[PDB]
């Protein structure tokens, strides 16, 4: 949180949003030198551009930031990369509501992110004042998003199942949450599907199970796909397909981040977090096409694609989650394969077995401007998962309906009587955009958290 | 054998074959109600269709089965899937000879097959009377074909080299045949080519060697390719190519099934069964392109395709078989690669080093309606197996003549003075056809067994 | 060296080079029978053809060899394959200079090469007299080239890191050079990049470090890529691409061969030879796309292609070489991928960080007729190696400039103040050409050695 | 040329290059306000960054431009995209020599380029003063480079053979050069290879032949590949491979641009420009693999790749050029296929049949900082062009040595006695770099022109 300043002072440099239509009238309120400079600079209010205005001394008086709209917020994410050095401040009066003011404060922080575990990088020299009224909420979100980005960005070699388990225990200690790690023989017996997928890796598979909160409160259970590296297994990926696969544990990072926000904000729920943590490797012990994998739910799965492993490990975590008849289950899973990204990289897919839940999450998406889109649990496609040998296959007969297929698979492990939402996310920025550096990224969480606050407070 | 009834009774429901041309005259011999019903039902004798005819009580009086011809037999294979519940019987008088009657009885049983090791399935409710005169032969064949289907259908995870060895020992116990298992260090020294192919798998390679019969009788030696799973090795298969690879031990299943029939029927031969049992895996210990593998025959093989492994392991089994100067050697091997299936999936390829043997097997094929087709050991193509480093390569320079190439490779290990037949089989039903459920399948065996009975009785 | 004779005699059969233009005048100097025979034979001096001329007894009098030019030399390489049996001799007077005479003597020997470790081969029956004045130089070169060919030709199974280390120790003993082998834990700590690449193989990685010569002499350090087998790693090669990969240690063979010539000829230098020896394997422990590998130079490398492993292991050897501030560093590395072979298979690429060195090597290439061609360390392409996570990536963003990219990568590990030459070589004959049998081959060494003799004597 | 100002005035805004090391001392010479502003802005001299400094009025006083070095020049190319509106000027005293001053002036203009034939674009608002002493040279180059960029950027539909011929005639009129267009039946008879390649297109093929200059002066003949669109023909390209193929006439654009500079600068030569202009299309009339194409040189070419068409059409233009025994022939051809771009996209390949010519062009490259690199006409690779049917094939047997192969093909049409240089160029900017907008680009020309001025003045 060193991109922010917390001691209030009367000498910070103001940053003011501006749109083209308001610039002429605003200039009329400024002195001669300011009017000449803004005109001489060529600044006209284009989104993402800035105009650094000098004092008569030559020091910086103010920075104008062109915005797409006064309620967009992400334009503020680009500030660290363009701002001159200094201590800056935003003005509450420049925003329609405290909510947009808080989003701008957070966007600034998100755009200041640099993953520096493997190379030295010069930190940005612009810092922003964070008012006490918004400090906890902005800090809680920034630190949680930074954690998600860090976990996804860490190379698989340094972020295997053990390291993921350690990260969960680190988060748990801050809130005295309890963590159980299911490994080796107990995993092999109790969670056979997690074991089958991860048994070929040099780093053994495990299940992370965290609990927190009042035992009398409604049970909210979060599940996240922790495939630390996905080679595809014997159905090996192409090089282009394998290049970003350190991110196939993005669902686990999201589930852990959401858990962290719930604990930071002390939501009145009984929280449980389940993360199957494995590597989908190629080697002498690899599970094979045609193999039948047993499950904790006592269903048999015929493996028709070793690279559709995420849903297989999630099936066991879900079977465990449902035993408690929780009030809500939410899972986060990363998408793999160019064709399965039906909604593109920046729009998480939502599946839900109950319409009220789906609609409430859609409403939350709009309120938070954290996009998501519902896809269907289209029942006729269950036929694509038909097996002549086992209860079902893990992948479909065709290259169509990939996303729906995975979600329908998981639905076999969750009763229609338990409210359940499944998120398919990309968890990565392919391009450098304001507030969104190339690499791991958090998505859907603000929407989900908003929903939880509305539902449980 | 629970699809059959063995206590003869006077109240079974008759099943009668019928062709369109005979239906009008047959109807003239029936009562009014029967004539009205057959006409009202729309049954006209189309192959595979049935007409269930009621008694005046509403119980079932008879079932007509449309047949392609009165000597085709496989139409009877579709009965379990369409018959109403009950105890049925065929009539010997409806067939030209006891041979067609027996084939119909067997086809019924073959179509009643359900592989249920991994899912619960409701058994068929129609059963057929099996007359005492045909009981042993039909049972012997049904149980042997079921065994072949079961072994092929079992996922590789549950059917590795050890499990295959156990299956052989189970069959051996019934006839007090002797079984030797060559493993680990002795295999590494004595059968280096079997070891090289299988050394990368987590389940180690072995050679199964079964013997039965009078030591004074003619030696018939059966050899079967037991590649429990074929990933292709470092020359990895495509996903479509690897999907059915649990079946790459189909040759071993066939050789074991043929051995079982020989023992059940007490053919007067000295039987030996040799099965190299391995997994062709990808891992740290995988044999590589360019590696030179030593053989039991003391020939060197340069590996030019790690996915042409079946012939490499068979070479050692054949080198062992020839040492005894047997009267006959027959090998069964499964085909891999869409392009190598020159005769399609339902027509086994036969290669033989002696013309009399090939012609006799062709004759047996026609007598049993168990199709096979001869392909040539075309000597000029030996040049395709030329190596600059070793005695020969294991695969050819081009993508043509795949089948011939494998057979010519094996011929280097078998003297022209020892009668030898090599069968390339697909061992799988891609589609659900009457009497032939999707999955593992037996082929060529009835023809081969007929030949053996004619030759050795 | 059994293709040569060392006891001088007056009854050897002369082999005489001939071009079409000189044949008519030469024939005029011969007897009637010789003139009739040469005309009757159809010999006209075409390059590579011969005319065996009889004595009146029917024994062989002389052999004419058609040559492309009197200074080409390689036509002599085809002699062992066409010569009748016997003891032959060349005539010094048939050559412009002793240099061409010596090249012809050597070419004869090079064309007599047969790799017979895995199959029996009949040796050639023609032998050539080697005069005492040229015996040491021709023998030194022939034995060194044979060694290079043998190491490259040996299948990877019989030429892993340990076997390569043993070969180096065998060469060292002859000259009492010292050899250190860096393995296991010390390698893991001190040469982490060599370890990361080779850790997945069943045969562990190591670094071979040989030293010889007067400690007061100029330091010449040779570095060679010893990838004993390259599967490509998780970014697995195609079968066609993996077929010749036993040759991916060709750079190590070249560096060892050059070291051997330096020691045989007692060049007044302080020689050091560094060979990273590893297998780039696929298995449970394989390094992955996205992994960040530490280096001896303390730079971080983001792995964007597991099949660009040679430069990664070389980086550690180079970082070690530079610590001594040597007078010269020369590395040899084999090319992988059809598209990276910009200069084709028979023209080694030279990169050098100092223009004088590059020009001197180019001059040496022309003097020795051992072809090489300079490619550029084009600095703007360093941008292709940009990483968002580490100091640099190991491979570029596109499929262009492959060779330049590898060389620029290595340049990050070598100061511009240390003269350094990097050779990208194919190290293999795809076709059987005179003096150049299919399989491993030595290239660039005569040019490099000539340069060293000119520079250090 | 509207990015430049030509009336000298005393009120232009100075643009001054600056490096980090000189900034502290420079600041010491400035007033208080300027020192405060430069420090407050965060400008430290990083290449490509600017610092707009205000006057006390708020108008712009000066712009500092960070440069990679004082002799690099391309940093000036980025100015139009970052400069505020205004009339600017450079200072001659800020450069080591008039040559670097002139390059900076030109780079500014090159970075102001916008291709607007198909969309409206706002022009840049910064203009630069162009001093009279450098006006002609800078204008001549800018207009010529703009022409090259425009021709390459024009979609193939609007830049077919006819449009290319029209562009040549437009350039010719300005200098009263003569132009002959060889079409239809005369082309079919006289230039059969140009006709064979282009006959399938809906826009017929032609040969453009321009002449200019004193008939007594040395003959310099320029040849350019005018493949207006390359589909690959029956050997059809992949979509990625065909996407930029409107640029396959880049060689023609280069040859025309070089011709234009020669005429603008009145070089004392007899200039001839030959451009085969065709579309390589797929349709009913497409030339085929295996077809033998006749040539103007009376050699036969067996077509082994319809997508190696550029060299086929160039062969006829070259055969025509050589008939006059010119003093020099220079051809420009665009590269096609990711693997053939051995030197990457930004480094043109030079081939030359005479060493003095190649060395002189290399020297010119260094003097002008217009990069090029020599590749070899490696004679042993002529064997790759062997045909069993015709005199030679148009493409090689392998996927290696692509560039060398094309150049060796062309060499069959040009005597070693005629000095000849062949340039393989990419002619496109894949990325937006300072002074180099995405799309068509000129390369190698400044080097070639420098050589011509040195050789012929
Ligand atoms: Cl990660
Ligand atoms: Cl099986
Ligand atoms: Cl080798
Ligand atoms: Cl164009
Ligand atoms: Li995955
Ligand atoms: Li196989
Ligand atoms: Li390699
Ligand atoms: Li082209």
UniProtKB/TrEMBL annotation, chains A, B, C, D:
- Could you tell me which PROSITE patterns the record lists for this protein? CYTOSOL_AP (PS00631)
Q: Per the record, what is one GO cellular component?
A: cytoplasm
Top-level taxonomic group: Bacteria
- What is the protein name given in its UniProt record? Cytosol aminopeptidase
Its source organism is Coxiella burnetii (strain RSA 493 / Nine Mile phase I)
Q: Which GO MF terms does the UniProt record name?
A: manganese ion binding; metalloaminopeptidase activity; peptidase activity
Q: Record's Pfam families?
A: Peptidase_M17, Peptidase_M17_N_1
Q: Which Gene3D superfamilies match?
A: Leucine Aminopeptidase, subunit E, domain 1 (3.40.220.10), Zn peptidases (3.40.630.10)
Q: What UniProt keywords are attached to this protein's entry?
A: Aminopeptidase, Hydrolase, Manganese, Protease
Sequence ranges assigned to domain Cytosol aminopeptidase in this UniProt record? 305-312
Task: Give the similarity note.
Answer: Belongs to the peptidase M17 family.
- According to the UniProt entry, what is the EC number of this protein? 3.4.11.1
Question: Its GO biological process terms?
Answer: proteolysis
């Amino acid at each position: 949180a060193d991109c922010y300043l917390t001691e209030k002072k009367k000498n910070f440099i103001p940053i003011q949003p501006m749109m083209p239509d308001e610039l002429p009238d605003w200039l009329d309120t400024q002195d001669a030198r300011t009017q000449q400079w803004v005109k001489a600079s060529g600044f006209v209010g284009l989104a993402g551009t800035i105009c650094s205005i000098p004092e008569s001394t030559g020091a910086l008086q103010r920075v104008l930031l062109g915005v797409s709209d006064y309620e967009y917020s992400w334009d503020f994410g680009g500030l660290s990369k363009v701002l001159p050095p200094g201590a800056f401040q935003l003005n509450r009066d420049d925003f329609e509501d405290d909510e947009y003011y808080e989003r701008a404060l957070l966007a600034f922080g998100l755009g200041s992110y640099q993953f520096n575990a493997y190379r030295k990088r010069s930190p940005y020299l612009a810092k922003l004042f964070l008012p006490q009224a918004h400090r906890k909420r902005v800090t809680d979100w920034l630190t949680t998003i930074y954690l998600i980005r860090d976990l996804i960005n860490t190379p698989a070699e340094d972020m295997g199942p053990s390291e993921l388990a350690q990260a969960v225990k680190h988060v748990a200690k801050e809130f005295e949450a309890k963590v159980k790690i299911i490994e080796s023989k107990d995993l092999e017996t109790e969670f056979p599907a997690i074991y089958a997928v991860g048994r070929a890796g040099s780093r053994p598979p495990l299940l992370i199970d965290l609990k927190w909160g009042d035992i009398k409160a409604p049970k909210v259970t979060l599940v996240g796909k922790g495939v630390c590296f996905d080679s595809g297994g014997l159905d090996i990926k192409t090089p282009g397909g394998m290049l970003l696969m350190k991110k196939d544990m993005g669902g686990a990072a999201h589930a852990l981040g959401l858990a962290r926000m719930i604990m930071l904000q002390q939501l009145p729920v009984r929280l449980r977090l389940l993360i199957p943590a494995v590597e989908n490797a190629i080697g002498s012990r690899s599970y094979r096409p045609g193999d039948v994998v047993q499950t904790r739910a006592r269903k048999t799965i015929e493996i028709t694609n070793t690279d559709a492993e995420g849903r297989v490990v999630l099936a066991d975590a879900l079977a465990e989650a449902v035993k408690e008849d929780p009030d809500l289950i939410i899972d986060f899973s990363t998408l793999t394969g160019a064709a399965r990204i039906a909604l593109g990289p920046n729009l998480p897919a939502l599946f839900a077995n109950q319409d009220s839940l789906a609609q409430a999450l859609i409403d939350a998406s709009l309120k938070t401007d954290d996009p998501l889109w519902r896809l269907p649990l289209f029942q006729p496609y269950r036929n694509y998962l038909k097996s002549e040998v086992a209860d079902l296959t893990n992948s479909s007969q065709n290259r169509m309906a990939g996303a729906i297929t995975a979600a329908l698979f998981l639905q076999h492990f969750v009763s229609d009587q338990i409210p359940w939402a499944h998120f398919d996310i990309f968890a990565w920025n392919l391009e450098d955009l304001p507030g969104r550096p190339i690499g791991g990224e958090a998505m859907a969480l603000r929407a989900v958290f908003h929903y939880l606050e509305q539902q449980y407070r």
